Amino acid sequence: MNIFEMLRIDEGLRLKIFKDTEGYYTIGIGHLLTKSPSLNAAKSELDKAIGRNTNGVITKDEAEKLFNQDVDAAVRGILRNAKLKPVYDSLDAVRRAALINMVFQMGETGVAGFTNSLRMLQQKRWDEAAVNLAKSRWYNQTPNRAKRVITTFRTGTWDAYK
Fold this sequence. Notes:
- The PDB classes it as hydrolase.
- The structure is a monomer.
- By secondary structure, this protein is mainly alpha-helical.
- It has one domain: Orthogonal Bundle (Lysozyme).
- 62% of the residues lie in helices and 7% in strands.
- The protein has a three-stranded antiparallel beta sheet.
- Strand 2 (25-28) and strand 3 form a beta hairpin.
């Protein structure tokens, strides 16, 4: 198991524009296009992202390309954030992936806001961090995915993804 396989499990793959769990236009492996209600706006973002006139449909190879960029962007976001980087540096590789997963889903600024959870992770109080993380809109709106990510922080294993 690795962060790419983990996020493939959590995000799935669809090659046509659809709406994500929040109602936002999305494509590929959880690539958010826009928060705009306008499908036309979403299609324009897609065309810009891919570099061709797509009319809402991409190939698997194109999906995987956006995905590579998005995972890269999540790590880059963590390493450039003064709140996330110390926590990331303090973690083992498995828990690092859990943090990348959260940032992929909610963005750098969102995760950076989890001030008390981040401190517990930094302190390596895994059960306590896990309890704190579940007290969130994140957990309530996507509880099965949040449970997998939280279990990964709690245990430092891939048990929730096997």
